[PDB]
């Protein structure tokens, strides 16, 4: 006489996430005058030395 | 490696070249000849969990 029993349980779980953000917050704006702009002295000196 | 002091970074040339750091909330005196010095901030972070 032979008797036999088997029980095989298995699982495969796979879980993932991804998250991405690109948020831009402007907080001030400016516009430069068109004329009579006062140059910086290091730039003025570079121009004068040319 | 950074080596010893080659350039004089503090020759003010008799100028009163104030900059407000914005960051650090203080006023600093630049040398008369530095082409620029600015205090906008960047941050980079990388994690690798495994």
Curated annotation (Swiss-Prot), chain A:
Subcellular location: Secreted; Target cell membrane
Residues annotated as glycosylated: 29
Top-level lineage group: Eukaryota
Modifications after synthesis and translation: All cysteine residues are assumed to be cross-linked to one another. Individual modules containing an even number of conserved cysteine residues are supposed to have disulfide linkages only within the same module.
Family the UniProt entry places it in: Belongs to the complement C6/C7/C8/C9 family.
Involvement in disorder: Complement component 6 deficiency: A rare defect of the complement classical pathway associated with susceptibility to severe recurrent infections, predominantly by Neisseria gonorrhoeae or Neisseria meningitidis.
Self-association state and partner proteins as the record states: Component of the membrane attack complex (MAC), composed of complement C5b, C6, C7, C8A, C8B, C8G and multiple copies of the pore-forming subunit C9.
Annotated function: Component of the membrane attack complex (MAC), a multiprotein complex activated by the complement cascade, which inserts into a target cell membrane and forms a pore, leading to target cell membrane rupture and cell lysis. The MAC is initiated by proteolytic cleavage of C5 into complement C5b in response to the classical, alternative, lectin and GZMK complement pathways. The complement pathways consist in a cascade of proteins that leads to phagocytosis and breakdown of pathogens and signaling that strengthens the adaptive immune system.
Protein name per UniProt: Complement component C6
The species this protein was found in: Homo sapiens (Human)
Lineage, opening ranks: Eukaryota, Metazoa, Chordata, Craniata, Vertebrata
Residues of the full protein shown: 296 to 345 of 934
From Swiss-Prot, chain B:
The family this protein is said to belong to: Belongs to the complement C6/C7/C8/C9 family.
Entry PTM: C-, N- and O-glycosylated. O-glycosylated with core 1 or possibly core 8 glycans.
Entry's localization field: Secreted; Target cell membrane
Annotated function: Component of the membrane attack complex (MAC), a multiprotein complex activated by the complement cascade, which inserts into a target cell membrane and forms a pore, leading to target cell membrane rupture and cell lysis. The MAC is initiated by proteolytic cleavage of C5 into complement C5b in response to the classical, alternative, lectin and GZMK complement pathways. The complement pathways consist in a cascade of proteins that leads to phagocytosis and breakdown of pathogens and signaling that strengthens the adaptive immune system. C7 serves as a membrane anchor.
Linked pathology: Complement component 7 deficiency: A rare defect of the complement classical pathway associated with susceptibility to severe recurrent infections, predominantly by Neisseria gonorrhoeae or Neisseria meningitidis.
Part of the full-length chain shown: 150 to 199 of 843
Domain of life: Eukaryota
Subunit structure: Monomer or dimer; as a C5b-7 complex it can also form multimeric rosettes. Component of the membrane attack complex (MAC), composed of complement C5b, C6, C7, C8A, C8B, C8G and multiple copies of the pore-forming subunit C9.
UniProt gene name: C7
Protein name: Complement component C7
């Amino acid at each position: 006489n032979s008797a036999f029993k088997q029980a095989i349980q298995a699982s495969h779980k796979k879980d993932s996430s991804f998250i991405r953000i690109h948020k831009v917050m402007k907080v001030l704006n400016f516009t430069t005058k068109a004329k009579d702009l006062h140059l910086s002295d290091v730039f003025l000196k570079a121009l004068n030395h040319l | 490696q950074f080596r010893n002091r080659v350039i004089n970074t503090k020759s003010f040339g008799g100028q009163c070249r104030k900059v407000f750091s914005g960051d650090g909330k203080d006023f600093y005196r630049l040398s008369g000849n530095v082409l620029s010095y600015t205090f906008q901030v960047k941050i980079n972070n990388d994690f690798n969990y495994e």
